[PDB]
Amino acid sequence: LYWDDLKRKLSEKLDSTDFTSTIKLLNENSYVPREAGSQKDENLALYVENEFREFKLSKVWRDQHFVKIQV
Amino acid sequence: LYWDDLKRKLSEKLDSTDFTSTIKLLNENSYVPREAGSQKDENLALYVENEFREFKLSKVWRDQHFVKIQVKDSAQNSVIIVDKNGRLVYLVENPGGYVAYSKAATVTGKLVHANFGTKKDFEDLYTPVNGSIVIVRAGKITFAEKVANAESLNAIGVLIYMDQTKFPIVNAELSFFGHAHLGTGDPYTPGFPSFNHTQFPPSRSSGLPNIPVQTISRAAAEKLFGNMEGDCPSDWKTDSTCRMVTSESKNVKLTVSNVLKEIKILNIFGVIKGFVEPDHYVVVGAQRDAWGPGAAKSGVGTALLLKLAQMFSDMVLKDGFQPSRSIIFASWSAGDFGSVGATEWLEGYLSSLHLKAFTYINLDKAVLGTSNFKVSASPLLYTLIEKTMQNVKHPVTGQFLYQDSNWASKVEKLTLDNAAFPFLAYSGIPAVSFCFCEDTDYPYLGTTMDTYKELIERIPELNKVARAAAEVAGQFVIKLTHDVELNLDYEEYNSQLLSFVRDLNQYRADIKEMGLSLQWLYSARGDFFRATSRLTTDFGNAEKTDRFVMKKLNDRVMRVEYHFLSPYVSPKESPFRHVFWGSGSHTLPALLENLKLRKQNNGAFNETLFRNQLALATWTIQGAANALSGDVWDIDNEF
Amino acid sequence: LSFVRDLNQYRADIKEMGLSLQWLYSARGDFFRATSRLTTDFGNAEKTDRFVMKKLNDRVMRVEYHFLSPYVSPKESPFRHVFWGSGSHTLPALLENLKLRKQNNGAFNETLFRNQLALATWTIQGAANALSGDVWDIDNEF
Amino acid sequence: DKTVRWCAVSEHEATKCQSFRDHMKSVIPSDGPSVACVKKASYLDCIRAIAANEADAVTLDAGLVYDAYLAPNNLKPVVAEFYGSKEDPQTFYYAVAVVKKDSGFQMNQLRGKKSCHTGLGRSAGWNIPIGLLYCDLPEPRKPLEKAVANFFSGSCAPCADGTDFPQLCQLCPGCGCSTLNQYFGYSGAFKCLKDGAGDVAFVKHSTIFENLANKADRDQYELLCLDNTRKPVDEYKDCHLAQVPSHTVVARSMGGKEDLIWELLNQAQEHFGKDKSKEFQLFSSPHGKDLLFKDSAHGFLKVPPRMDAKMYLGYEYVTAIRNLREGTC
Amino acid sequence: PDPLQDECKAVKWCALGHHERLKCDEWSVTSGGLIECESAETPEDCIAKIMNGEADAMSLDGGYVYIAGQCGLVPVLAENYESTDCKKAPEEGYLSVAVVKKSNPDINWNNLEGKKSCHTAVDRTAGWNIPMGLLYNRINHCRFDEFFRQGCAPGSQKNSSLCELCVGPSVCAPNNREGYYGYTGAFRCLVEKGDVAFVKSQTVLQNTGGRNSEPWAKDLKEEDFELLCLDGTRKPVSEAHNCHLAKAPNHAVVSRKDKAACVKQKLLDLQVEFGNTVADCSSKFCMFHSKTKDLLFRDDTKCLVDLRGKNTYEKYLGADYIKAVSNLRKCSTSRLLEACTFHKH
Amino acid sequence: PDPLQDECKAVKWCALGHHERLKCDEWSVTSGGLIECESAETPEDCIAKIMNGEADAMSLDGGYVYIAGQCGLVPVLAENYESTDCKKAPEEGYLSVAVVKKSNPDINWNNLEGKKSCHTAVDRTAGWNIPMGLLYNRINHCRFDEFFRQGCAPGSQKNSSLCELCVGPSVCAPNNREGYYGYTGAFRCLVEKGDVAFVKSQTVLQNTGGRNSEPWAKDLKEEDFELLCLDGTRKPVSEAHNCHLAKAPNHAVVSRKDKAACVKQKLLDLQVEFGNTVADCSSKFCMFHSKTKDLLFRDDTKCLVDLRGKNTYEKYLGADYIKAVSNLRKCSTSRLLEACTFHKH
Ligand SMILES: [Fe+3]
Ligand SMILES: [Fe+3]
Ligand SMILES: [Fe+3]
């Protein structure tokens, strides 16, 4: 396909996507005070991880790390 | 054409090439005392340059450089025995040669004799050098190191002489030339190239002695010992005559007056464009300068370089040889001062050479005898050295170079004094370096006696020998080009890495007293193993026809060597970053070497240093893995 | 070029000091050609030779990374990019020190500058030798 | 002395090549240059073959000369065709747009018509006319093939990808890139119009004269001029789309045998040029038109030393080709 | 290009070699980017860059103006050498002479065959076109490298006789990286190795009397040189007026038709703050002043003057000059000129 | 291979996962390179490496010995568990049992349908072949993941029921990166989530009475568990002898015919300095001792004993075992086994 095609497609796809809903969903008490390395944090993390899997995209993994934060 | 073809051709071509003539030609007064940056030097330089042009090979250029070399000042350097006042006996000698980059000063005091430049090891002897001049034999290590250690023990002044046993030279009134720089290249442009003196003119001490170093004639050595009470041990695989300490009654004074002298080094190149990966080269070098006539130190090399360049070009035009990757011959200069020529070239592609040069061969001191066949290189060229020593027959013995009685051949590590060392330890280019060596190193080497005569008087069939050397060098080139797959042993590093892990496990106890888990290291070592296993697989599944998929692989191979250079140390500070063959605290060997001290229960062990050493040395290896593939984005996300 | 320009506003200071500032122009140029070849090789290559294209795109892919001072350790100064980084290796940082020269006070570290320029030059230079020049850049004269 | 491996595109060229080989053998001495014939399916295979040392020479239309110059092929032009007469050799020719009499449309009314092209990327058949219509094309204009396919209501554009752009082969199913496609080239593009498959044929000023011997048959056609008028076919000098550089023989930049190529062709034109021989003709054939060299050529001229495609083609023409490729309106 | 306006944001200048580049950069900074710099290693390459809009403008000697014109560029503004009043029309041109050493007693116009020659560069007016064409009309062949025994005519074939006297790092290049390149270079060439130099009439004066402080010229004296007159005699250098080869059109700035106007206007403006008027050139920037010799413009350039209708290379160079360069067409070795004359329209 | 001699320089061992690798490395250093280490993530991959000489040897449970044999490898030496006298013949085999919690009153042999199960790994003798085959002969179909409600049988399909109890970082892998992998892992699985574990008879003892110091097992008591007898009853663990499923051939070392001898000899020798005899294992290296559980060999391994003529997998495993694994052939899901049985000779 050519640019116009991709441009046009990408647009209509953008024309039919509720961003506001997801910006809200990412506000439910399920993951609200999603501080760094918190449970909520880890919650949304797994949400994104699964969503990606659900998106049926190719390989999708996790990246673990142990850094010192201050509280 | 196929290997047999190239092998057979290259042979007959080698069967009809007079190496002895050119080794002689490079001795005519036209270019004899071809010191670094001298006129003669510049003469031969243009000779090679033109010869290359005459060879009708593709592009050929020049490489200019202005580095600071050290020379003998008009004022005479000398050693003189003298008590707590004046010289009683006589001025031992006014040395005919000198040790470059030596501290320009003059001091006097006691004179200890630490066999073989202290070797760093030998320093663990009875008599202390705590504030006193020292004598050492030219041998096991490099002047640079000999001096370095001497000073590390707080000594001052160092004399280097060629004893009789080690150096069976009839003449004892003979003097030789030295180096003294604990590094490679101009000692004021570490990692980055040099300029004018007018611009960027620091003095020194940037990895230089700071202690006078003077070469002394055996005769002079004789006399020194003459004024010494101590008695030379049998431990020293030497022979009678030397003492250990000067007779208390009096001491000795060393006076060296040398001066820096900006010269213009001239590297001469010349390539043979490839046909498929024209931009991946095989650097073939050869020192061109020398103090004396250096028929050995520099003759044989340049001799081979030329004759060897003459052949491949010919093979390409007349014989139909189509090297898949370009070859680039290079005659460096100012090599007697630490490969100053070749090094400052590398200094120039501080982070891209490996993207260009995939292997560096070196013809320096290729022919020195006819007994042994020493070989030093990066494990990446191990199988090439092997399979080739199985194709080349000794010049004297009708038999093949390879000792059929083993399955594991001997390969030596590259030393600070080999142009190949920088290519590998600084630029991350795998490099080989053979030698038709002898149990005893050539004597006339660093002296005015390195004549084409005394050479051939000591090696009758020099032609056949040089031919062999030119053959192993040739095959390396044919081999590193003939085929479409870049043939480097990136596997040998798995072993090299496991060996480390092993030796390290011998301190699992110490590792335990410290909270260290040492688990991340195994992961890296493993994360890397897989990387190689994929590469080693992807190759097999790829077809030698998809110029694309092959290029993508060969490039990965070409990364292997370079990526073992600690990406956590600055070239400007520690130029030899290669964790395996470099020099510094980033060095893998250096890690164990510090840990060994743990057991000594003393403070010799720097714990904070170790902690990092391990920590980084881990991520170095780790990275080497993530860079060598793992299909990108290595997914060992668990751990 | 913008750098070179802003730097020429101190050609006076550069002169009081023995500095030739000639090597920098060479790099800046040795780099310009590099890009001119790449910009050319592309045009002459066909969007069908997956091979010749891959060899080019890779060069393009090197451009940004190679402007990271290969003379400073990530462990010490992580933002090595001579242009957008942070540290004395920073190109902007060079001018920023030179500006102090005029203040006639000690605020200007001369030895620091000397290097800053020296390396910042070879950084750019290298960026060039890495971005092609058909490899082995042959400006052997100079 | 020695052999020049000529790259022949398909059967007909292959047949003429073999006759070319045989006739030169009979006149050239044992010490003269000789021809060997290498058959490929398309000009693009001939370009790869020369680069790969499988062949040595091939004659290309100037628009394809540009492509041949590009990496990784890097071929260079070595010998040029000339037209006109030996008396006043012309190293260029005119791109025209031929249509039938009273079909009732001008150049500004091409949208929706059916087009016959000599071949994708060729000067007269493609580069010039598509270059002139570019902004009349609907967006998106990338890829070009797609905008062109949407502007006309069907075409024959030889060498185009019929899988990707089926409307481009609507008049010549498959878009065959050789004379096996009867609508390929100058004469094929003209046949596409004459047969009634297309409304316009993008060819050269001599095409119609090479195809219709009677003036009365030729009076049934006209040319579209850029001012939106039409003129008779004799009036091409005042009604043409552009002047373009001659077709040229290309060769490798290294080990290319350019000396022998010139030697072979210079002798070939002496023995077998226009009206020279009753046995064989370099510039015509019973097997087809424009095989190996154009039938309208009268001879050859050697290109100056080391001239590259860009210099050969000239800034203008190169600019036009570039501007078609990225091109901004 | 819907109803648009203003492409005249900045003018991109094409500079040869390193030095011209430096000067251009300096001119860039100071203008606040009104002048942009592109570089190339040869005049022909610079003209090519401008032809294909990789650059917009450069100044050129008449000989190169001819090539530029055959290649479709147009002259925009001329360099005037005689007056500081920039509203003056372009001069009729500079004097082209042949200079020898007083030391050398035997050389004369009718004696050149065999001697050693020095030329600004091939294809330049005073260094080549004038003298070579006038010699050509005498020897009626084109192997100038066989008429002189040896020489330095930058831009010639690396291995002809005519490159044997050159020296500059880049040996024989048509740029500053050749020492004997240009009006000055050819003079030095004369001083050091040649028997004859072809240069402009003001050259001796600009390089004698300590006016040129380089080692090779600091002690030179105007009286040490003579000119060759067409009639076979010799005269002091102060006599060019009555002892010159011909007149030579002034160097001129060239561009493409599309950008001529833009180019003009920005040059005329920039001249207001950077031309003759600048009292000191080490403090503020000077167009017509050069660190070395003749970078981007001739150092003796006074004004860039409007061409008053001579907006065409045939018109600006003038008939006589055209007629002379044409007679030499058969000896061209210019790759760019053959390129620009290939198309038949 | 002209008249040659001695390929037995070093033996290359294939190790699963990280831990086995570490142990191997350690064994390497200390031997002075008589043992070389290659690694893989699964038993099948290890067998493949050995098939194609990427490695030479590994020790394996009987179930995997079957696969190895169908793939052309041979047994070389057996692991003996009952005696320290390494000259003894191989034992008839270990006891295979089913263990439950005393807590749970209702579970029994005839009751498994529906419960939660724990298995060493798929394809192992005590964890799978014995129990699954004996159940198969009862349900006459192969959806074991539908007979049990849920489980942890490492090496099963990532998304079947039988992977739902697994935990180890690498969930459900047939290696140590799965927590519930092996004799021990399956026991823990029982302790923490399952109703039945299929393991060897000595397992309970090796993991109760503080003999296993991990948090999960330190306070466990032998008396907390029972065995399932085939007749439907339950018995204390001290009664395996009269309450086991079947006998299971000992784990055995495998290689290729070409290298069997080499492998043998070096193992027999290495055993002399690194086997049972080593009085302390934290000072000197111990083959049969493992940092974790059962790396390279079973930790209860006493001797590696010569096979005395049972140099063939059919011969070593024995008829009964072969007959049992064959009956389960139709449920295999082993990709390597299908591979090894493709060729028709
Ligand atoms: Fe055409
Ligand atoms: Fe002029
Ligand atoms: Fe088992």
Side-chain angles (χ1 to χ4, degrees), chain E residues 209-268:
Chain E
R211 313 200 191 58
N212 184 330
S213 67
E214 291 178 9
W216 67 272
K218 188 42 170 191
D219 306 327
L220 298 176
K221 295 302 194 133
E222 146 171 37
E223 291 89 4
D224 297 328
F225 303 100
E226 305 190 294
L227 308 180
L228 300 186
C229 312
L230 286 169
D231 65 19
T233 63
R234 300 167 47 153
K235 279 196 197 156
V237 145
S238 61
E239 286 279 298
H241 189 265
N242 304 304
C243 176
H244 65 273
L245 308 180
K247 283 149 141 320
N250 296 13
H251 294 199
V253 179
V254 301
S255 220
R256 310 163 308 254
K257 302 233 190 265
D258 69 299
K259 218 151 206 200
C262 175
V263 174
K264 186 163 172 182
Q265 219 23 73
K266 320 297 253 54
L267 285 182
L268 285 185

Side-chain angles (χ1 to χ4, degrees), chain E residues 61 94 183 251:
Chain E
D61 162 62
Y94 59 102
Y183 297 120
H251 294 199

Side-chain angles (χ1 to χ4, degrees), chain D residues 8-266:
Chain D
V9 180
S10 205
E11 311 313 312
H12 306 128
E13 281 209 344
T15 299
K16 183 173 179 177
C17 187
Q18 119 199 337
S19 281
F20 177 28
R21 178 196 55 198
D22 291 335
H23 288 275
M24 290 291 299
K25 256 183 248 144
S26 79
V27 294
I28 295 308
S30 63
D31 46 33
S34 80
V35 186
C37 302
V38 172
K39 173 161 90 214
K40 297 289 189 193
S42 71
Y43 77 93
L44 194 29
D45 297 337
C46 280
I47 284 175
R48 308 283 195 216
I50 292 165
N53 198 19
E54 295 277 352
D56 305 306
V58 76
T59 310
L60 294 175
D61 165 89
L64 304 179
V65 169
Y66 178 72
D67 289 355
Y69 141 93
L70 309 168
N73 306 110
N74 315 112
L75 298 193
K76 40 170 216 183
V78 293
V79 177
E81 283 183 350
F82 75 83
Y83 315 99
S85 68
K86 320 160 184 173
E87 309 89 275
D88 174 46
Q90 332 195 90
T91 49
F92 60 94
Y93 55 101
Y94 300 103
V96 299
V98 184
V99 295
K100 268 152 180 200
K101 189 153 188 182
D102 301 322
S103 59
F105 62 92
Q106 293 316 144
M107 189 93 188
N108 55 0
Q109 301 151 9
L110 279 175
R111 202 182 272 85
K113 301 298 153 319
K114 293 184 168 43
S115 62
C116 307
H117 307 262
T118 51
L120 196 58
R122 301 177 52 139
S123 302
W126 184 265
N127 290 348
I128 294 325
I130 299 312
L132 290 171
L133 298 160
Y134 191 83
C135 302
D136 280 9
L137 299 189
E139 328 211 28
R141 308 200 175 88
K142 210 161 173 144
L144 189 57
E145 277 91 334
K146 186 268 199 210
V148 172
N150 293 326
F151 181 91
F152 291 120
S153 64
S155 304
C156 172
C159 324
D161 189 346
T163 304
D164 282 45
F165 316 103
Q167 306 100 297
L168 289 193
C169 315
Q170 187 167 317
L171 278 40
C172 57
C175 281
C177 197
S178 74
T179 60
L180 291 182
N181 169 6
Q182 68 161 344
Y183 288 166
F184 168 88
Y186 299 110
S187 285
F190 178 74
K191 185 179 192 297
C192 166
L193 172 70
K194 173 183 159 197
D195 281 356
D199 302 303
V200 63
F202 295 108
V203 295
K204 64 180 298 187
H205 64 276
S206 72
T207 312
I208 197 161
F209 304 95
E210 289 180 42
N211 292 280
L212 292 174
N214 317 320
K215 201 250 191 224
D217 278 300
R218 304 200 293 263
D219 284 335
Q220 279 319 111
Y221 294 83
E222 309 177 286
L223 296 183
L224 297 174
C225 322
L226 300 164
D227 64 354
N228 306 316
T229 74
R230 283 175 177 221
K231 281 199 192 236
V233 305
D234 321 89
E235 298 172 33
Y236 62 84
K237 274 169 144 143
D238 298 287
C239 178
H240 61 263
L241 311 186
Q243 283 192 354
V244 292
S246 61
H247 288 202
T248 174
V249 178
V250 299
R252 280 187 294 285
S253 271
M254 188 183 281
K257 309 175 165 174
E258 49 261 71
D259 47 355
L260 302 193
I261 284 168
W262 170 244
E263 193 177 318
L264 164 75
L265 295 182
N266 193 27

Side-chain angles (χ1 to χ4, degrees), chain C residues 5 11 25 28 32 141, chain E residues 21-22 25-26 28-29 169:
Chain C
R5 286 299 188 66
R11 210 176 308 178
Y25 295 74
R28 143 91 184 314
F32 200 108
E141 176 52 294
Chain E
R21 208 326 198 314
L22 293 183
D25 287 344
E26 162 144 25
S28 212
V29 171

Side-chain angles (χ1 to χ4, degrees), chain B residues 66 123 161 177 251 288 311 329 338 346 381 383 424 464 479 496 595:
Chain B
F66 286 84
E123 287 301 57
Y161 75 78
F177 169 60
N251 46 63
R288 175 175 58 61
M311 293 192 268
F329 312 79
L346 305 168
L381 294 163
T383 300
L424 165 63
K464 277 293 191 63
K479 287 292 227 310
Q496 276 304 306
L595 198 66

Side-chain angles (χ1 to χ4, degrees), chain E residues 253-307:
Chain E
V253 179
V254 301
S255 220
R256 310 163 308 254
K257 302 233 190 265
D258 69 299
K259 218 151 206 200
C262 175
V263 174
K264 186 163 172 182
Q265 219 23 73
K266 320 297 253 54
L267 285 182
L268 285 185
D269 293 9
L270 279 157
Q271 194 161 234
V272 168
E273 283 192 12
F274 294 92
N276 74 51
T277 276
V278 175
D280 185 39
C281 290
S282 253
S283 57
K284 179 201 200 172
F285 187 83
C286 286
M287 280 161 61
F288 311 134
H289 182 83
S290 147
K291 211 177 153 108
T292 277
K293 292 303 186 106
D294 288 341
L295 307 184
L296 327 185
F297 303 95
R298 260 168 58 161
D299 294 329
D300 50 8
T301 301
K302 259 21 144 40
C303 286
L304 297 182
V305 305
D306 173 277
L307 300 168

